[PDB]
Each structure stands twice: as C-alpha cells, then as structure tokens.
C-alpha cells in the first residue's frame, strides 16, 4: 500500500496540478497523489491572505491524508516555511518545494525536486520535525531554511545550524530535527483569524533615512523590524524613530542585513531601555513571521522578547 | 628604508606599556609596536563616529583627504567601524584617484576582550598597504589574513572574526607571516579609472534603501518618492523581483524621473538587466552583484554624472 | 558555587597547565579549573595510545567533576573527538579545544578559545550531546567536526550537518544535537584493551599506484579505508588489490576524498559483490576511527555496514 | 556565422528524436538540439574510460590533441567524468599552448535521470568555448552556470551538481541566458606561458599520494620509495605536517633524490614553505593551495624539467 500526498499547489506548475503524476510518473511508484491548486500567485505577490489560507487548509485537511508537499515560488518560500511551521498543528509532514529553472527550460530542477518533496512527504521519519524545505537533493527546517543566491539551483540552505537530512535514492539519512518549538508546540492559533498585525521592514545603510520608518509608524503599524548593520544597529535617524515607535505602540524588533549570525539581547544596543526585541538568528523577513504571530497574543515588549527565545 | 603608511582613523580604536592620550590613533599605534618592524607609520583622526552613523560628509572628507594627501606617504590604512566598512571601502573603490595601496581594516571583538582581532588585523593591513603589488588593485579590505577587493567584500556573520568575504568573486590574495600571495585583481573598473571626480562636491544625490517580503507595504517607497529622492534601490526578492505595490510605486516614480535600481536581499547572485522584470519598459536599472548598499554607492555616483537610466545601466555594468 | 572542571592537556599550553588560571583569569569567574598533563606530543604524532590513554582517564575519573576540557593541536583534533564521542561513557560535557594560532603570536586565538570551551564544559544544557570541540564561538559534535583551511581561526565546521549552538558573551543557544548513537548509546568499551586494530588509509587520484594498498595487505592490515573519488570510486589497480584484501580477512571501507557528502552504499560499487563498506557522511580519517572500533567487536563486513550506519 | 566548436569525448554521454548511434558523443550533440543556435559543433570520441581510471596515457593523447588541432577549430569543450576532472583539468592547463578556449564540463547525475544536470552543463561549457573573452584564461571548467579556472577547481560534495567551486580563489563568471560577466582571471601562469611541453613525451614521472593521520602507517611511503617513485606527494595535517613515521621514510627518500612535496589533506587553504616544517634542511617543497592531487600533476611535469627541489619549489611558486 503506498501513502497519500495532497500537494497545494500556490503558482504555475513545476514539472496542471492534477497532471503532475503524468509529468513525474515515477511519483506512482512511492506515493498516491492527488493535487489541489490552492491559490494561484507569484510568490513576489505572496501575503497574509494566502498565509491564512494554507494554514487553516492543512490544519482543516489533515485527517483526509498521510501527508502534504506545497508547490511554490523561491522568491519568499522561506517566509511562507516558517508561518507554516508556527500555525500547523497537523503533526503530518508538511514539505514545500520549488524551482530555480523553469519547468520548460533545459535540465529544469522541479521534476526530481517534486519527486524527493514526495518521498519527504512519505518518509514516516519526516513527522514531528516542523515544516520542511526540499531543495537539491536536501531536507531543511522551515525555520533557518532561506535562499543563498539569486539564480542557483542549489540557492536553499539552512545558514545557522545546516541541514536536517540528505536524500539519496529515495532515502533519507536524518540526523537532525529543530529544537526550536514548532506546529503544535506553540500557541499561536489562526483558526479564527482573517487579518494579521501589520508588521513592515525598514533596511540600515550609511546615511539611512528616517522616512520610511516615519511612514510606518505614522501609518500606525502594529510591528517594525528593523535590517540592522552589523550586529542588528541602527543608523541614528533610524534608531530615534524606532525608539518613538516602541514607547507609543509598535512593537519594534532587531534583525540584521547581515545573512548569517543571530542579533543578540542587549549586546549592541539597550534593549530594556528603548523596548526593543532582538531576532536571534531570525533575518529580516522571518522575524517580520514571528513578529506578526508574537502581535495576535501580545503587545508587551517583554513577552515579544520571550516568544523569540523559543520559536 | 620602510616605507611610510598613514593610518586613517574614522572612530574607536581596534587595538590596545604607555600612556594614553586624547587622539584614538596615538593609542592604536603604541598599542601595536611590531607595525615599527614593517612601515613608518603616521596617523590622523579623520572622525570620530561609530560606523552604524557612516554617511556622505564622512565619505567625501575621506576621498577629499586621499586624493589630497596621495603624494606626501607610500599608502594608506583606514581604521572603520565593521557594520558599515563594505559601503565606505566601495565609495573610495570608485573615487579614489591615488593609486597607491588604500586599505580598510576593522575588528569584530573589542580591543580589551579576550583575543582581540584587531592588533593582528592592523599588522595584516599595514603589510599589505606597503606591499608594492597591493598597487593598482583598487580599494582593499584587510581581515582574518585576507585581502578583499571594496567591490565584492561584505560582511557575511553577525559577530565572526572571519565574518569579511569576497562571497561572488573570492578574495585577491592571503597573507602568511607577512607575505601576500596575489592570484586575482577585479575586472570592474575602479580608482582613477572611473570618471566620478568627489574633488568639489559638497553633497551627494540622495538614494533610498526599500526591503521587499511578503506582504509589502509601498509606505516607504512612497514616502522616498513624496520627499523626491534622487534614486531608490530596491531589496527585492529572489533575481530582483518586487512585491506588486512596492513595484506600482517604484514603476510611477521612475516615469517622472526618479532613479530606479533593482538589487537583492539574497546575499550572493547578480540580480540580472531584464531577466524577472523588464527593465526597459519601467526604466529600472539591475544592480548586477552589487547588495542594495553597495547598488546605493554606485547610484549616488552614477546620479552625479547623469539621470538617465540607460546611461545608469551602462555605469552598473562597467564600475 | 561553581562548577568543578578538569583541563586535560594533550601538549604545549594553549595560552604550565597549571598556571591556565592565571594566564586567562576570567576563567575563575566561571569555573574551578584543575589542570592535568595526561601526555606531551604534536597533535600531528598523535596516536592509537593516546586515544586510549584518553578515554580511560575520562571515563575512570568521570566521578571525581563536573566536565573535561581537553586541550589538543589542531591537526588531527578531529581524530580524537570521534574516537572520544565513541568511547567514552562519562555523561558529563567533554569538550575539545585547540588555537589555529600560538599563545605567543598576536591576536592568539587560544584564550577566548579555552574560556569558551569551560563555558561549554560548565553549561548543564552541554550533558548528553556526544563529545564536543569548541572552536572560534561555536560548539560542534565530534562525528562532524573537520578542519576545512590550512589557517584559519575559523577552520572548524561541522560541514555537512551544522554546529550544535554559538557562544555569546557566555551563552549558548543549543539549537541542534547529533542523531547518530554516541558515548554510553555505542557499544565499544576499550576499559581493557591496550592496543587497536591496525587501518590505514589510501588515496585514489588519476594513475594511483596499487603498492600503497598491497604493503597494507602484505602487512595483514585488519581494515583499510579508501579516500575515493567523488562517490568513493576507486581507480582500477586500487579497486583490484582491495577486492583482494576484502576476501582474505582486511575490512575495506569506501570514504572520499571529496571534503562533503557522503559515500552511499551500492550506488557508485557492488559493495555486496566485493564484500565493502560505504562509510557514509565519514572522512576517511573518522571513517578509520570507527573501522578500528568495529573490527574490536566483528570482522562481518555486514555488520561493520550496520555499525557504519548507526555510529 | 557561429563558431566550430569540437567536443573531445573521454567517456559516456553526460546527456540523452534521434537514431543512437555506436559513437557516445554523437548521440550527446543530438540529445542538445539548442547547440545549433550557438556553435557549428562536432564531436571526436578520443577515448571511452571511466573518470575514476583516467591515467597519464589519457593527458598526453589531449594534450597533443588540442595542440595538434589547434588551428582547425575556434574551440574545444572536453567530456569528462566528475572524480578526476579537476586533475586533467590542471594538467591541461599547464601544457595546452593553444589560446582558444578549453573548456572541461561533465554532470553529476545520469543523462537518463529526473532533472539530468548534463544538458545545460554541455550548453553553457559551448556558450563559454564559443566567447571570445574566454580565451587567454587557461583551461577552464564549466558546471552549474559558473566558469571555474583549472588551477583552483575542485569538487566539494559527492552528490550535489553544484558541487565544482574555486574554493581558495572563487569562480572566474558567471552564466546568464547565455552571456558570461567575467570578473577574474589566474595570475599563475598557465598554458603558452609555461615550459612544459608534452609534444615529444610518450609517459611522465612516476608521482604517489600519501595519506597522513594519527598513527599513520610508513608502509605507502616505503612501497613507493622501493619502487623507485620520482616523487611522493604528502596529504599532510593541518598546514601540511606529517606524522612522525611518514616524515622519516620522506625525510630519507628526499635525501636519495626522491621530489617531496607537502600538501595537505585539508580542503582549503596555502601548504605554506619552512612555516610547519623546516622545508629546507629536508629538501622537501610547499604545494601552496595546491591539494594533493593537484600537487602531482604539478611535481609530475617539475619533474620533466628538473629533479632540484629548490627549482621544483620555484615552479610550485609561479604555475
């Protein structure tokens, strides 16, 4: 008896979802699979809006399966990974998957990816381990999972803390899992949510300005994260904004431009003194993920601080 | 004879039996007395700001200084704060007309902590400031026994005294016991082949900085355009691309003459001329390699010489 | 009261042994340091009576503290882990720690090296990961640990699965811990042995000579491993002399030269067919580590496969 | 008009409507259509091994291949396995004297594979040997979109098709839509600026690789000194050491006129001269970034020229 695979397709397809078994035919020999198109954008475009839609259709869908591959652009995979791996509470594998080449163009990478997405999606040791990243031949958490390169097909790595497993033939060699709570270990819950706080992404430089935070916070925005230099500072026209932020209602968060590494509490920057949080190993975009979450259950600064020292 | 090197202090000392004195780089120096056995060296406190508040004064007092000073020593060493150095050591990269050795250096522990960087690290740019074939390289950066072309170096790791990478291209040479085996040179033009001339400019363009993720807000593009920016980079997703609104913004601000540069949040890659977006219909440029500061540098400088983006492509695809 | 930790010095002093305290004074501040030299060699003349010299000291004197830091040259630091990883029984925090630079050398990395490594050695969140080296603000596992530059500070990295959790001003985020079975999960006991079997390694490359494997076979060799090329291939005048020693009593393991990856069983040779071992994500040098290991227990090239992919 | 362009098959097709026929690199060109729009293309069988027994006998048939045909072609793209391609890739690039572009390409996964990694990879190695600004950068290795020099070349992982980095020096460019942004070319001297000419040689020196690690058996280095080796290659430890038994077999061998050359078993990084060991009072030589097996190909054709170590050691300093 093979398992079942429900694969939610986001986009184009990438080797149409109900086809993807004609295209991979080698997909019969590990799995039963049956496509939905899910939501129809490129991943450029990806919002909130698709964000709530996958979660509560995993979460909604997972008894009627063994498990789930999701089919999406590159562009922000790793942002939508890490949502996923906060708001499923399906304890199924649930495995995105993309492509660097288009399907029609030469040695195109979604056929096999596709297929090693699957036998993810199959590998009894693929539960309880958060939402998964197959790329190139790889296993990564959806939680240090972030794209390296603008066109390689080998671009997905886990940057901080590397891979979870190879695969091989069809096999996979786990020899890692996230200690970081995911899925059904955290408390954030979007079953009933049609909206998320609104959380925005100000970037740190030589001679930064302070419009686009003062935009932000004159917008009235829930959240700002700031892509710090450095260990997550901030150019000082930047850094009075944000300080007016954070005691007037915008949670304000500490990531880093800078691609490895994690912003440490209270290290560059006096934290407690202006209400700030500080993202760890979270870049920019995933600690925008975890902000957003953080903001449906709590507004105080050191509560915030608490949920990025365990997600 | 030792050839004579200046040090060119921007802020803090990296490094440091003597008696301290009110000059930063009086104290760098007595701090580190082996630079003694390989350079004559002098300094001057340039400024004194941490490199998080880098900005344009600093960057031409800095070129002004060099291109002024170029005959009176054999090389330069400029002491910079780490969070910002890549964009400083760019902007001499493609300003500088000297074309002896101009080398940045830093340090990721403090100068008191356990296994300070910084006094090897100082040692290492010294050596390779007074290295005769450091020469006609471009602007250079110094770090962990490595020497860095200002173009393609950044800084990869948060906290890492290794953090210092040429991630596209690799490093121009390693240094072993104060030797420098060179095997590379950038391509790119730079120095006193570029035709951007700081000599009498007081001020640059102002250019911009705008992140793309999901669910982007066009508030600060918006809000960029509303004050008439010169240029905005754009910190697009995967080869460049932009959310929807942020795209709107930047596609109408680029019809009534603002600068548009496409670069990329993705840490390596060209973001490529009309490969995910088309370029020649929205009047965007792609910033090829170049991170959204480093695209910044070069649009502040390319917006000296010209506003049109054609022309702009052509400076981001030779400098 | 703080916690009570055993220096254990292999050679020439990383920044004598007894004088740590007081050439890096910071460590009082976090620890009970006590000091011994258990043995005086170039980490590049270490060897099979070291290794056993080692786990017998930690193992004997598991009772008498709290952790071990074990001071060690950089060169072969990676052989000793693993060997330590698999043969130590002590379930207190082991942690490795070497200097790409001389104590006397500026910027000498030593210090801050060895304050790390008791940071590690004291952290009760360190017990139960396995053997670790703590190198340039990073704990990594013994399996996966390997030097990747002839220089650097920053040489150590866990390649193919990640480090464990990064040092900051005294703390670590674990975020990560080895699968693979280690110290009291491994059945190898070397509490009587004095000596271990003899393996050597070899090295294929275009036109390799056949006479480095054939003076190990000559030799009666117990095991030989082979540093193949890309997926442990072997150039033809090797994979014949091995064949040979593979049916006259040598144990042949498959590893590669190739400094990633790793070597998958019956994929690129019949290991069933001449009777080989793939050795996995194992370096040749690690890969010999655990053949030693193996061939005290089995000499069933089947079960010295299952110890391959268990340890 | 396009460029004629040869391929030089080694082994199987790396690719594959069509008829197949008996000749691999016949049915390669029509498994890759998309060749015609970029190269007058055609393809020479010049041997069928696998890349794991590639030999001697095999770099000097293409050598004289290349520098016999030299002028009947605009290029050359060779089909090589992946385990050894970064050995024939130097060898080429120290004895081809042609200066049209040679370009090294293979694929990690089989031509009947799901995403078959061989198509594209021939494409662009034809896209490289087909530019003009190719030529006069040695021989060159072309594999996932990136052109890689033959010197610094090597795999990194067993499996990954991205797995051929320049791990000291970085890549040379890097391939779009069919278009090369290069940024760099090797200062070590390559190709018709070497000496070693291999025109008249019918074999080369006999060159063995020694493996150290803790407790490192004499044996290997003992069987190639008996058998007479005119050189050894050492995969030291860290900064090219050697384990004390393995530095006593060398020790004596060099004393008795066999070339000794320290590299190192560690992936990156400069086998640095009289910095771990006293190359001197030993007679042995420092590989430098060289790895073992590069090391050989370079103490193979040294040992052409001159069996002197402090000549050998000259040569491991400039090619």
Same mark, same amino acid.
């Given at each position: 008896?093979?398992?079942?695979?429900?694969?939610?397709?986001?986009?184009? @397809?990438?080797?149409?979802?109900?086809?993807?078994?004609?295209?991979?035919?080698?997909?019969?020999?590990?799995?039963?699979?049956?496509?939905?198109?899910?939501?129809?954008?490129?991943?450029?475009?990806?919002?909130?809006?698709?964000?709530?839609?996958?979660?509560?259709?995993?979460?909604?869908?997972?008894?009627?399966?063994?498990?789930?591959?999701?089919?999406?652009?590159?562009?922000?995979?790793?942002?939508?990974?890490?949502?996923?791996?906060?708001?499923?509470?399906?304890?199924?594998?649930?495995?995105?998957?993309?492509?660097?080449?288009?399907?029609?163009?030469?040695?195109?990478?979604?056929?096999?990816?596709?297929?090693?997405?699957?036998? @993810?999606?199959?590998?009894?040791?693929?539960?309880?381990?958060?939402?998964?990243?197959?790329?190139?031949?790889?296993?990564?958490?959806?939680?240090?999972?972030?794209?390296?390169?603008? @066109?390689?097909?080998?671009?997905?790595?886990?940057?901080?803390?590397?891979?979870?497993?190879?695969?091989?033939?069809?096999?996979?060699?786990?020899?890692?899992?996230?200690?970081?709570?995911?899925?059904?270990?955290?408390?954030?819950?979007?079953?009933?949510?049609?909206?998320?706080?609104?959380?925005?992404?100000?970037?740190?430089?030589?001679?930064?300005?302070?419009?686009?935070?003062?935009?932000?916070?004159?917008?009235?925005?829930?959240?700002?994260?700031?892509?710090?230099?450095?260990?997550?500072?901030?150019?000082?026209?930047?850094?009075?904004?944000?300080? @007016?932020?954070?005691?007037?209602?915008?949670?304000?968060?500490?990531?880093?431009?800078?691609?490895?590494?994690?912003?440490?509490?209270?290290?560059?920057?006096?934290?407690?003194?202006?209400?700030?949080?500080?993202?760890?190993?979270?870049?920019?975009?995933?600690?925008?993920?975890?902000?957003?979450?953080?903001?449906?259950?709590?507004?105080?600064?050191?509560?915030?601080?608490?949920?990025?020292?365990?997600?």
């Amino acid at each position: 008896h093979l398992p079942n695979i429900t694969i939610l397709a986001t986009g184009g @397809t990438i080797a149409g979802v109900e086809n993807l078994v004609n295209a991979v035919p080698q997909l019969k020999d590990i799995a039963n699979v049956k496509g939905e198109q899910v939501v129809n954008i490129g991943s450029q475009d990806m919002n909130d809006n698709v964000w709530l839609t996958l979660a509560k259709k995993i979460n909604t869908d997972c008894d009627k399966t063994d498990g789930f591959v999701i089919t999406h652009g590159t562009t922000t995979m790793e942002e939508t990974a890490y949502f996923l791996d906060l708001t499923v509470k399906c304890d199924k594998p649930v495995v995105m998957v993309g492509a660097m080449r288009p399907s029609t163009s030469m040695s195109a990478d979604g056929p096999f990816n596709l297929y090693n997405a699957v036998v @993810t999606a199959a590998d009894k040791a693929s539960a309880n381990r958060g939402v998964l990243v197959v790329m190139n031949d790889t296993v990564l958490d959806g939680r240090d999972v972030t794209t390296t390169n603008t @066109t390689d097909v080998a671009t997905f790595k886990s940057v901080n803390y590397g891979p979870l497993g190879y695969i091989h033939n069809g096999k996979i060699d786990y020899q890692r899992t996230p200690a970081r709570k995911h899925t059904s270990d955290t408390p954030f819950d979007v079953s009933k949510l049609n909206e998320l706080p609104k959380v925005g992404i100000v970037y740190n430089y030589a001679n930064a300005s302070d419009l686009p935070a003062k935009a932000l916070v004159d917008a009235g925005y829930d959240g700002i994260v700031s892509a710090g230099v450095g260990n997550g500072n901030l150019y000082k026209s930047v850094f009075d904004t944000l300080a @007016t932020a954070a005691k007037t209602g915008t949670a304000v968060v500490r990531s880093s431009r800078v691609p490895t590494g994690a912003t440490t509490q209270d290290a560059e920057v006096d934290d407690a003194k202006y209400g700030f949080v500080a993202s760890g190993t979270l870049n920019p975009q995933k600690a925008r993920v975890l902000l957003q979450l953080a903001l449906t259950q709590t507004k105080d600064p050191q509560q915030i601080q608490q949920i990025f020292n365990q997600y």
